[PDB]
Amino acid sequence: FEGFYKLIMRRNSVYVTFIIAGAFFGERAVDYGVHKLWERNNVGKRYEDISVLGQRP
Amino acid sequence: AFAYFVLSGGRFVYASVLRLLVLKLIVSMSASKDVLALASLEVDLGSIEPGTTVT
């Protein structure tokens, strides 16, 4: 891990930006994945899956 | 070097949690859904005499 250490951990200012980037990108990656599991576990039960949606007289 | 990499992973989450809790309190002061539900309508009016104004 020392090659990684030499680019990011040497200065705290970079290492702080590394933690902010990982907070951003890590949070987005979990958001997408949790939503994909929810879609796959609830097939057909969504609002866009109402067959007569838009056809109320 | 391995230790600092392992610690940064948990540091991603602490920052994410801190951001989420701060933004929850901030946006709770924003306009509520009922308030936003009364922001568009039309009203009609008539005619008034010269040199005067009506509010």
Binding site: R11, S13, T17, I20 | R19
Partner: peptide, 28 residues
């Protein structure tokens, strides 16, 4: 000649943080 580098590196940290707390992608 490092104080200018520490300033530039902490400004990048400040800019990344600002884009992170407020995420104005819809406004850019």
């Amino acid at each position: 000649t490092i104080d200018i580098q520490a300033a530039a590196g902490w400004g990048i940290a400040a800019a990344a943080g600002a884009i992170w707390v407020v995420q104005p992608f819809g406004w850019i």
